[PDB]
Structure formats: structure tokens, C-alpha cells
Design a binder for these strands. Structure first.
Ligand code: MG
Length: 1260
RNA sequence: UAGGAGUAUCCACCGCAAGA
RNA sequence: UUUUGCGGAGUACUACUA
């Protein structure tokens, strides 16, 4: 119970010592860490890097492939149908056999066509046929495949087969020939993609967006090529199954114009697999790269271009499947941004070229382009801002090799764009990256380069090259810490250097080293604010689970991964958190408290493993999987520092995930309020000075790696709380002491890769030297990333306040404003300075007099006071292990960025493409209702974040169509409700299918399942008006669902991810024991037991619950997407605990609802269910239907945007035993709107209705 | 090099029977 | 290193906050 700990004793250093040190520091000429942006400077950087690039990578004469799928279209494309497929295949094979092969790929294509066209009739009846109507015919062993034996191949075909089944260089970007060729080729590709092929919601949609965006895009070749590529990717997905990838296959599209030959390949349901295919197409306008075509066969007034043997992974294939939809979403978002910026609808040519560019980017899913765009998204803020570290960003840009031809075009475009942006510094002009039109607001530009960036999927890195990269950042900084320990001394590095040591050395102010006096002073300045709210601090600290038993919280028993025990091999075993909780409970006598658990697990060493986050950035970041004692320590420290963090301002990680924007906008508004007026400074009779603001959007170089975790200890020893005795503080200090050293474990993938290396070249031996035994190494000082995320931000705020106090002491005469926002490494600093008026000759005289008086430090305030302010702030932050990165820090007079949001004065620009495009590339997979809700719920989030209602409606339509195609619910597919349900496909329960297309306003206000609920109401109304059999029929379906993600009446699994093995402790108790015990203790399904035996039984039951079990197995997203698209035709419905097709569930529902009769209990339950629970949602739709809209003549000039807000005992009810009594007793939406819109719950809906038209204002 | 990735050597399938 | 006949091959995912 809180063991006695030695704690720490204050050093008692004075603030005046730091003031004297700062005076000495500022009495000298200090170089600036940033470079002012100029067109000449950017041009010089580009020229020098271009000249020096050729010496780094070997020169290459052959630009490499950049198109994953090459296909050309000349006529309108219709969706593929099985009959529209057989005839196309016949004509296509006739055309191919007419041709003459040239290359081995052409020989393989010819052999495939000759084999296909000579298949007998019986196979082709079995071909193109479903599973039920399919039989093996000695030539077709799967519904859509055919066998091609090696004996049925020519010499060149088997040579190509042997090639398939049997140093980095960069293009000379400095040359003008390479740039000219790349630009000429990609301009031609874009031009061919741009060619033309020979209620209130719907009213406004058709008037504004459909007429000006969709109607324009319906005729472009990019639209129909995207449809064709969707068809090709669907054919590849169907063929890539676990039983169809063995054999070959031929498909045809566009009247035999595009022919897809799928070769045998590893099935995509296995890791490290590629789908291998060829595509033959008549040469014409389209996505044709003639240089990288394998062959161009020639016939009479015909050119058939045969592409190379492409190998596409599952991620790129699924990206290409949704390429057209992603391009359309991106184009609609631009369209909205252009309308907001220029106030008029974009012209035809611009809206066609933008769509072509977005589609081309969506098709070319390559990592090099993703890295280039990731660098560009940081380069653009650098050149626009007044001061930034743009030379470092340009060097990183030039780091990569430009092997492809698309990368050279993108590089040329970004070079021209950056030179133009820098030349127009000092409502400005901002040229568009894809279009010729210029912009009036910077938010529009950084939002076309963000939307362009987000078209690339997550996880395009190498599966083994990037596994070794994530360890390097940790190992290199651990080695640097070891070097500092050996050089300066272990005691000095861990404890910290005194002020006099820094003064004598003047080199100790480095990363991974902290100054004891600085830490104490920062803690004192934080206590200066904590003294007022000491009572609240004590209350919040005691509100933390200090005495509540462990493993009774959601965090301590969850599905999150956790390091297990060191295996016999030596690697750190990976396991579920709940598994480790069950183990510990089984190996313990009683459920322990947090502090008791810390007492038992204090001696054990912290251990961790690093695993990829699968990001879309240039370099993948890794997150650390920590073991159980490490989790306990980190929980103690994070709870103690989260209690304090919530009680002070300028701390933004402690705030909510939605309140951050509100708080930062309030801070910016306060800063702007200070800017009003003028400051009078005493001559000692006043001088007038103009108040000016400067925003520094900062980002620390290294937060986790380049840090010393010991600096918190002394900090914790000085932070003042309202607790009577410093016992909890001592416990937290001890926990910080025990987390100093960590056993960083190399991943299994990396150790196998290094074991199979066979030649340990340099830069790998040095990395392997960190692990002495070859499996783990000691990391000191570094607290693993993610952990301690609130303590670090609190420390940063403390250091910022220390700098503020130091600056106030240094220059008492001047009045300056300081606003700080610290969200972990991300930070924003608003400094205020007094610029003199009329040349400030009196100000210069005052400065000269001050220097003559004896103040040698005033040499840093005569001109550009903000430079001195930032220099002192950076140095004082460097007294701790906080270095502000010269690379990704921007100094601007007007614009700013914080938390990946852009601020122009008080205006905030939340990107919503991250949300819209995210609604299309993933799915929970729990069920059709649970997928539709997830797809629609994201589009509501975008609508809150600033998406226009028309763009949100279009994205909703695209997501609904994609979901319907995925599960087959769409009309004309296998799982169409209308065929087996005696309905119009509109009055079908949502869990069973039916039209999920809803008004965006209905989802925004009423809810996501609203239509389903509406159905019930309508049905009930029928049964209360006409006693119609149809309504009674709908009533039977709802009862059927209840007898058989959001919480409602849903029809129990559609997810198929069942485990391949039983878990470690799933069989601890027999099923009879759990079945009896669940009935004996009814409440335990609502609250978590606090007794070991009861908690152990509850956890074991949680291990045997199918709902929990299926969630553990699902670890890799989009594999459910692939499996659903491959097998919507059969194998899954969860009918009476049996895996059958969904059609049988539809038939069973039909039978049940046909043999269903109305009873008093069910009807009364339905009447209560519809009236009571939905009493608020029905009113929401009634308000929507009780509204009217009319357009008044006035163009919509958007104003500044703001952020607003949208506005236990059950265990007692069934409680029986005294232990249950104790258990229950112990247990007990931000939106972006305009300026004029208030925070009323209905005013936001009124604004959403008002913003229906992007150009013409309307009145509600 | 036919593709993905890369100035980290990777992925691009696994077994049996029978014949050479 | 190959040919034929068979059978198969379900993807490690942290604390953080509404
Ligand atoms: Mg930032």
C-alpha cells in the first residue's frame, strides 16, 4: 500500500541564474536556424541539388513502368454481363488468333487464345456458370478458369513461363531531354484521358453538381476507362481466389477490344502473393504507355498493344478497384474548393483535366510517387511561409531516385510550382498544381496537394525492406545515447548537468541531455499556475484508479496486442492483453490494485517490440508493443500526469479529440484580440508602437528518440499537487525510474531476414552490434513513442512558460504576448512584438541608450524582436531534450498550422478528404447493416468537418453503390432482395438488404438506420389504417430479425473470420461450468467483476464468446473486402448456426413472414418501440420534411469558418448476492460552420440546408 | 527485370505418385 | 533442373480522445 520511497530533494536553483545566463546568451550574435524564402534562393537550391544528384545514383537510359493496368478505350463502355462476356471473348480470341506473335509474351497470349477458342462446348457451358451449375469437364476445373498444360505451349511461351518462375538507378533529371520526354508522354496520357467519347436535396444536386460536374465527366474517356478498370479488377479479384489462382483464364470487355489474360499465380489470400496478368488492347486514346508496352502487334489498320506481365499485390488491386470512385471523390472535393475560392463554377476544361490527373494518380499506385507527394505536402507550407527550413526539405526531395517517367513529370511540376510560389511572396495568388487557374486562398492549394496525396493507399512499402527501417531510428539514437554516456559520464547524463556546467561547456545544451536547474525552474513556473487550482488537482488525481482493482477496466482487458514472455528462442512472444490478464490472474491469489501490481512487478525489466503502423508517409513509423509490467508503470505515470494535464490550459493532448479545434481557435482569437491597439513604452512620456503577431508552426525533431526520460523525474519531484503527503508523487517517481531502461527486441521478420542475409555488408553489422545476443538490446533514456504522450506535452508547456517568465524578466519595459499550444511533438507558438512607427528613430535611440546603460542583451531587440524571441525559446527548450526541427517548422505572419489543420486568422480549414476517401477503402465486415452504417457514418463526419451537402451526398451514393456491389445487394445480382422477398427492394429491412440510399440530411440529423426505422413506422401505419397483408408481411421480417456496429434489430454474423485454433485459456473451464455460472450471476454481463475467481470466470467466458473471438482473428483490413467480393455468390449467411448462402436466409424470412400472424404482445412491443425510443429521431425527420427552401439572388461569398458543438444501475436491478452488491456499488460531435452560424442544435441543421447551393444563397 | 520494392541481399507457392 | 496425374495454401495491427 504505497510503499515508502526516497523521492528526490529540490536543488533550489534561482530563476535569476537563468536570467543572467540568458542575458549573456543574448549579448552575442546568434545565427538564425531558418532561411528566408526567396525565388532566387529556391532556384539556387533546386539548381545545386539537380547538379549534385547525378553523382549519387547510377545513370539509367530506360525509364521504368509506372502504370499498373494499361488499357485503351475508343467507344462507350457498358458494364460487363456474363452474356456480354462470352461473345466478347469469342470475338477477342478470333482477333488475337488472326494476329502474329512477336515476343514471348505475345506467344503466350496467342497460345492462351488458341486454347480458349478450342475449348469444347461443354466447358463453355460450365464456364461462365455459378457453382451450382458447374461440373468438372477435364478442361475447366473452376467456374471461370481453364487449364493450359506446358505441352499445350510453344517454345517461346514456356520460355516466358521460365522467366516468370525463375543496383538502383535514377533517370538523369538534370538533363533537358529526359524532362521533355517525360512531360510530352504524360501530357499525351492526360490529353487522351480528357477526350470525349462518342426533394430539395435532389433538386439542388441536379441543379448545381450533377449539371456542372457529373454531366461534364460522363463524356470523358477517363470515366469509361475507370469503369473498364473496375471491371478488370473485379475479374482479377474473382480469379484470385484460393481455388481459382491455380489455373489460367481469359476475359474480354468492350466488344472484344480489351482482353485480360490471367496467368497462374499465388492466391491473394496468402501473404506475399501477386496476381500475374497480361492485357491486350487496340492502340488508341487511353492509359497507354507505348514505351513500356511488351509488344505492339500490327494488323491491317490495327495496332494491338500487349502490356508486360504485370504482378499486382492485393493492396494495389483493391486500390485500382475503387480508382474511379476515388478520382470522382477527389474531383468533387476540388470542385467544391474551387467554388468556395473563386465564387464561380469551374470551366469545362479545368474540371476535365483535374479529373484526368486524379484518375491517373489513382491508377499509378507506386511508393515513389507517394513519397514525392508526402514531401510536397510539407514543401508547400515551407515556401509560402515567411521563414522556413526549405533547403533541408528540398534536399530530402532530391534524396530519392527518379526511376520512373511519372516521377520526372511530377518533379518538374513541383519545381515550377515552388519557384512560382516563392517568387510571389508578400488574398494573394497561389497557382494550382494540376490546373492552370490560380487560387486566392492558400487553403485551396494545400488542399489540392493534400487531396492528391491521399489518393495513394496505405502500406505501399516493401514488406521486408521497411521492416528493417523502423528499427534504425531507435537503434541509432540508442547508440548516440551510449556515446553520450561514455563521453560525458553516466551520472551526468541520467541526472542532468547543472547550470554552471553548461556555462563552462556551452556545448552541453544538446538533445538527450537536460539541465537540472531548467527542469526545476519549469516545474516552478507550472506550480505558479497550479497553486490556484491545487484543490482541483488533488480531486482529479484522487479520481484516478489508484485504489480500484486492476484488470477491471476496459484498457487492462481488451483485444489490443501485448508482448508476452521471452520464448525459448529468445524473441518476445506476442499475445492479446486479455490473455496476459488471465494468465496473471490464474497465477495470483487475488485481484491486485494498480499500486499493489506495481509493487509486485517493479523489479521486472521493461521490454518492447516495434511493429509497422502501415502509414502512407515517405518512411513508415513503428509503434511499440510493451509487456505487462511496462504497461502498469506507463499507466501509473500517464494517469498521474493526465490528472494534472486536464487542469491547465495550453495543454491540448489532454483535451478531447474534438475540443482541440475549439480551444486552439479560442487561443488564436485571444491573440488577435491582443493585436488590436497600440503599446506605449516609457522613455523615462511614451513612444507608440504597433502590435504585430507572428505564428510559428513548430514540430520537434525527435520526440521519443532524441529524449531523456529521466528529465520527468526531477520534474515530478517538483510538480505541486493538492495531496497532503508526497507518497503518490514518490510512487510516480519510482515508476519513472523503472521505465528508464527498456529491452528493445528485434522483430521476428527482421531476425529471419538478417539470418538469411548470407553477406553482412556494412551498415548492417553496425545495426546488429546493438543486439549482443542477437535478439534484444538495452535502450536507455528513450521512452517508447506513444507512451508518456501527456507527460511530455506537460513538460513542453512547462518549458514554454519558463521561457515566457525569462523573457518577461529580461525586458520588463516591453509588453509582449505569448500564446503556446503543445500537442506532443506538434506545437504552435504565437509571439507578439512591437514594431515601431515612422522608422522608430526614437526606438533606435532608446535601444542605444539602454545598451549604453549597461544592458548588453538589448542587441537582440532593435530590429525583428520575434527572431530573438524564437532564438531564446528554442534555446530554453533545448535546455530540456526538446529540439525544434529546422526542417518542418514554418514562421508566418498570417497563416499557421496545428494538429494537421490550417488556420488563416480565425478561419480553420479541416481537410475532409481524409474522411471521405476513408469511407471507401475499408469496412468492419460485421454485417451488411454494420458495413452500410460504417460507410454512411464516415460521410456524416465529413459533413461535420466541412464537406458540402452535395459532395457528401455524392460520396454517400458512391459508398452505397460500392457496398451493394460488394455484398451483391444491388439489383441484378445474386443477393437481390426483390427476387426472394416479395418487395419492391425499397421496403426491405436494411439488415436483409434493400435500398440503403438515403438523404444525407436524414443521416446527419435523424440517424443512420433511420430508413429501417421509417419502414417499421410506415408498416405499422399500414397495419393501423388498411390492415394490408404487405404491411403485415413487412412486420414478419422484423420479428424474424429479432429471433435471429450499431445496436438495433439486425440479422448474427456476416463476418466469416473464425479462428484457426483455440486460444490459450479458452478451455480453462468446461462449457457447462460457464453456462451454469452465467445464469447464477446474471448481472456480470453488464459490469466487470472485482473478485479474482469471478473475474477469471468472466474473462474465460469472454474468451469463449464467438463475438469476441471473431474480432481477435481479424487483424489485416481489406482481406474481408477481397473475401466478400470473391464469394458474395455463396458460403455465408449464419442461418440457424450454419454457413449457407444468404438466399436461404431470404427464403426463410419469406416463409416466416408469410406464416406469421399478429399477436397482442408483438404488436404492442412494436408500437412502444417505434413511439418511445425514436421519439427524437422521428421529430428530426419531421423537422426536415417541415422545412422549405427558396433561392434569392446573391452570390455566396464564404466567410471565416468556425467550429461548434452538436448537442451501472442495471446491475443493481438483477443483483442478488452481497459480492454482486459490492461490485455494482463500486462500479457506480464538433462541426465546422460559417461565422454567422451559432451553436444551437438546430442552427447547424439550418446552415446545412442553407449551404445546399454552392453559388446561390438560399433562405430557410 | 516480366512485375512490386529498393542506394537492406526480399517477394514473386506447397506436398505425393508416376515417367526421363 | 523438368513432364503428366492429383491434392491443397484464410491474411503482426500499440497507450491517445471524444
Ligand atoms: Mg505542426
Amino acid at each position: 500500500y504505497i510503499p515508502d520511497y526516497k523521492g528526490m530533494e529540490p536543488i533550489g536553483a534561482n530563476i535569476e541564474d537563468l536570467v543572467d545566463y540568458s542575458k549573456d546568451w543574448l549579448s552575442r550574435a546568434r545565427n538564425f536556424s531558418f532561411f528566408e524564402v526567396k525565388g532566387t534562393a529556391v532556384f539556387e537550391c533546386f539548381n545545386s541539388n539537380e547538379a549534385n544528384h547525378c553523382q549519387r545514383y547510377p545513370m539509367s537510359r530506360k525509364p521504368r513502368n509506372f502504370l499498373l493496368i494499361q488499357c485503351s478505350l475508343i467507344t462507350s463502355y457498358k458494364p460487363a454481363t456474363t452474356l456480354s462476356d462470352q461473345i466478347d471473348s469469342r470475338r477477342a480470341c478470333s482477333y488475337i488468333l488472326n494476329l502474329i506473335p512477336d515476343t514471348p509474351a505475345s506467344y503466350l497470349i496467342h497460345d492462351m487464345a488458341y486454347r480458349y477458342i478450342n475449348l469444347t462446348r461443354e466447358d463453355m457451358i460450365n464456364y461462365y456458370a455459378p457453382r451450382i451449375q458447374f461440373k468438372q469437364t477435364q478442361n475447366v476445373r473452376e467456374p471461370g478458369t481453364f487449364k493450359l498444360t506446358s505441352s499445350m505451349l510453344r517454345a517461346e511461351s514456356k520460355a516466358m513461363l521460365d522467366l516468370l518462375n525463375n543496383q538502383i538507378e535514377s533517370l538523369n533529371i538534370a538533363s533537358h531531354i529526359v524532362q521533355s520526354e517525360s512531360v510530352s508522354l504524360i501530357t499525351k496520357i492526360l490529353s487522351d484521358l480528357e477526350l470525349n467519347i462518342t426533394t430539395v436535396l435532389d433538386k439542388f444536386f441536379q441543379n448545381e453538381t450533377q449539371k456542372y460536374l457529373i454531366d461534364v465527366l460522363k463524356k470523358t474517356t477517363a470515366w469509361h476507362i475507370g469503369h473498364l478498370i473496375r471491371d478488370i479488377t473485379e475479374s482479377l479479384i474473382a480469379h484470385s481466389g484460393l481455388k481459382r489462382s491455380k489455373y489460367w483464364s481469359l476475359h474480354s470487355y468492350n466488344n472484344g477490344n480489351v482482353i485480360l489474360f490471367i496467368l497462374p499465380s499465388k492466391s491473394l489470400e496468402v501473404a506475399g502473393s501477386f496476381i500475374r496478368f497480361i492485357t491486350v488492347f487496340r492502340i488508341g486514346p487511353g492509359l497507354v504507355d507505348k514505351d513500356n508496352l511488351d509488344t505492339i502487334l500490327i494488323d491491317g489498320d490495327s495496332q494491338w498493344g500487349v502490356s508486360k506481365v504485370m504482378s499486382i499485390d492485393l493492396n494495389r488491386l483493391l486500390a485500382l478497384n475503387i480508382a474511379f470512385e476515388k478520382a470522382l471523390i477527389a474531383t468533387a472535393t476540388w470542385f467544391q474548393y474551387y467554388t468556395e475560392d473563386q465564387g464561380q463554377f469551374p470551366l469545362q476544361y479545368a474540371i476535365r483535366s483535374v479529373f484526368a490527373n486524379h484518375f491517373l494518380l489513382a491508377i499509378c499506385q507506386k511508393m515513389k510517387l507517394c513519397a514525392i507527394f508526402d514531401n510536397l505536402r510539407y514543401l508547400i507550407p515551407a515556401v509560402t511561409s515567411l521563414y522556413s527550413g526549405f533547403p533541408s526539405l528540398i534536399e530530402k526531395l532530391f534524396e530519392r531516385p527518379f526511376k520512373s517517367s511519372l516521377e520526372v513529370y511530377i518533379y518538374y511540376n513541383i519545381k515550377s510550382l515552388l519557384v512560382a510560389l516563392a517568387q510571389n511572396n508578400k488574398s494573394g495568388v497561389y497557382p494550382s498544381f494540376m490546373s492552370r487557374i490560380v487560387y486566392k486562398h492558400y487553403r485551396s492549394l494545400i488542399s489540392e496537394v493534400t487531396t492528391c496525396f491521399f489518393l495513394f493507399e496505405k502500406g505501399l512499402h516493401g514488406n521486408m525492406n521497411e521492416e528493417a527501417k523502423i528499427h534504425l531510428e531507435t537503434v541509432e539514437w540508442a547508440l548516440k545515447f551510449r556515446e553520450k554516456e561514455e563521453k560525458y559520464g553516466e551520472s551526468l547524463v541520467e541526472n542532468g548537468y547543472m547550470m554552471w556546467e553548461l556555462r563552462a561547456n556551452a556545448e552541453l545544451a544538446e538533445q538527450q541531455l537536460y539541465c537540472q536547474d531548467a527542469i526545476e525552474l519549469a516545474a516552478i513556473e507550472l506550480n505558479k499556475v497550479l497553486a490556484t487550482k491545487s484543490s482541483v488537482v488533488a480531486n482529479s488525481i484522487l479520481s484516478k484508479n489508484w485504489e480500484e482493482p486492476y484488470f477491471s477496466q476496459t484498457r487492462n482487458i481488451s483485444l489490443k496486442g501485448m508482448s508476452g514472455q521471452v520464448q525459448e528462442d529468445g524473441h518476445l512472444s506476442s499475445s492479446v492483453t486479455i490473455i496476459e490478464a488471465i494468465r496473471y490472474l490464474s497465477n495470483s491469489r487475488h485481484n491486485p490494485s494498480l499500486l499493489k501490481l506495481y509493487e509486485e512487478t517493479r523489479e521486472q525489466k521493461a521490454m518492447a517490440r516495434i511493429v509497422r503502423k502501415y502509414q502512407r508517409t515517405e518512411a513508415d513509423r513503428g509503434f511499440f508493443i510493451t509487456t505487462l509490467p511496462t504497461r502498469c508503470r506507463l499507466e501509473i505515470i500517464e494517469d498521474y500526469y493526465d490528472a494534472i494535464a486536464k487542469n491547465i490550459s495550453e495543454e491540448y493532448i489532454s483535451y478531447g479529440g474534438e475540443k482541440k479545434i475549439l480551444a486552439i481557435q479560442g487561443a488564436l482569437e485571444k491573440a488577435l484580440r491582443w493585436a488590436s491597439g497600440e503599446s506605449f513604452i516609457e522613455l523615462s512620456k511614451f513612444i507608440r508602437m504597433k502590435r504585430k503577431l507572428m505564428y510559428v508552426s513548430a514540430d520537434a525533431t525527435k520526440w521519443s528518440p532524441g529524449d531523456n526520460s529521466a528529465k520527468f523525474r526531477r520534474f515530478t519531484s517538483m510538480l505541486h499537487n493538492g495531496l497532503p503527503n508526497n507518497k503518490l508523487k514518490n510512487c510516480v517517481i519510482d515508476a519513472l525510474k523503472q521505465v528508464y531502461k527498456t529491452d528493445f527486441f528485434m522483430s521476428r521478420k527482421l531476425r529471419n531476414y538478417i539470418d538469411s542475409m548470407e553477406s553482412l555488408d556494412p551498415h548492417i553489422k553496425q545495426f546488429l552490434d546493438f543486439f549482443p545476443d542477437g535478439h534484444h538490446g538495452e535502450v536507455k533514456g528513450n521512452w517508447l513513442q506513444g507512451n508518456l504522450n501527456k507527460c511530455s506535452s506537460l513538460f513542453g508547456v512547462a518549458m514554454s512558460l519558463l521561457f515566457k517568465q525569462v523573457w518577461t524578466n529580461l525586458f520588463p519595459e516591453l509588453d509582449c504576448f505569448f500564446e503556446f499550444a503543445h500537442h506532443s511533438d506538434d506545437a504552435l507558438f504565437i509571439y507578439g512584438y512591437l514594431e515601431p512607427v515612422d522608422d522608430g528613430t526614437d526606438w533606435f535611440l532608446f535601444v542605444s541608450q539602454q545598451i549604453q546603460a549597461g544592458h548588453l542583451h538589448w542587441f537582440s531587440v532593435n530590429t525583428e524582436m520575434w527572431k530573438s524571441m524564437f532564438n531564446l525559446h528554442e534555446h530554453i527548450l533545448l535546455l530540456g531534450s526538446i529540439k525544434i526541427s529546422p526542417k518542418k517548422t514554418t514562421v508566418s505572419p498570417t497563416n499557421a498550422e496545428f494538429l494537421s489543420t490550417f488556420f488563416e486568422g480565425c478561419a480553420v480549414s479541416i481537410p475532409f478528404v481524409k474522411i471521405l476517401l476513408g469511407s471507401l477503402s475499408d469496412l468492419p465486415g460485421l454485417g451488411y447493416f454494420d458495413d452500410l452504417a460504417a460507410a454512411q457514418s464516415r460521410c456524416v463526419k465529413a459533413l461535420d468537418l466541412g464537406a458540402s451537402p452535395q459532395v457528401a451526398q455524392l460520396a454517400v451514393a458512391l459508398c452505397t453503390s460500392k457496398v451493394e456491389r460488394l455484398y451483391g445487394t444491388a439489383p441484378g445480382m445474386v443477393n437481390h432482395p426483390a427476387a426472394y422477398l416479395q418487395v419492391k427492394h425499397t421496403d426491405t429491412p436494411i439488415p436483409l438488404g434493400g435500398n440503403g440510399a438515403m438523404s444525407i440530411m436524414e443521416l446527419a440529423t435523424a440517424g443512420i438506420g433511420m430508413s429501417d426505422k421509417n419502414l417499421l413506422k410506415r408498416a405499422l401505419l399500414g397495419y393501423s389504417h388498411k390492415r394490408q397483408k404487405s404491411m403485415l408481411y413487412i412486420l414478419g421480417l422484423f420479428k424474424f430479425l429479432m429471433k435471429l456496429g450499431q445496436f438495433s434489430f439486425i440479422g448474427v454474423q456476416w463476418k466469416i473470420f473464425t479462428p484457426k485454433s483455440e486460444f490459450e485459456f479458452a478451455d480453462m473451464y468446461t462449457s457447462k461450468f460457464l453456462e451454469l455460472w452465467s445464469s447464477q450471476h446474471v448481472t456480470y454481463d453488464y459490469i466487470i467483476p472485482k473478485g479474482r475467481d469471478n473475474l477469471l470466470i468472466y474473462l474465460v467466458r469472454k474468451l469463449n464468446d464467438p463475438s469476441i473471438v471473431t474480432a481477435m482473428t481479424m487483424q489485416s483490413p481489406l482481406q474481408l473486402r477481397f473475401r466478400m467480393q470473391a464469394k458474395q455468390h455463396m458460403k455465408v449467411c449464419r442461418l440457424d448456426g450454419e454457413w449457407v448462402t444468404f438466399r436461404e436466409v431470404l427464403a426463410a424470412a419469406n416463409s416466416f413472414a408469410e406464416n406469421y400472424s399478429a399477436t397482442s404482445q408483438d404488436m404492442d412491443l412494436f408500437q412502444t418501440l417505434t413511439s418511445c425510443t425514436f421519439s427524437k429521431e422521428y421529430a428530426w425527420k419531421d423537422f426536415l420534411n417541415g422545412i422549405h427552401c427558396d433561392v434569392i439572388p446573391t452570390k455566396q461569398v464564404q466567410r471565416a469558418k468556425v467550429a461548434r458543438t452538436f448537442t451501472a444501475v442495471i446491475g443493481y436491478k438483477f443483483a442478488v448476492t452481497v459480492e454482486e452488491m459490492s461490485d455494482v456499488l463500486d462500479t457506480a460531435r464538433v462541426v465546422i460552420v460559417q461565422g454567422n452560424v451559432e451553436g444551437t442544435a438546430e442552427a447547424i441543421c439550418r446552415y446545412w440546408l442553407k449551404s445546399m447551393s454552392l453559388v446561390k444563397t438560399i433562405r430557410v
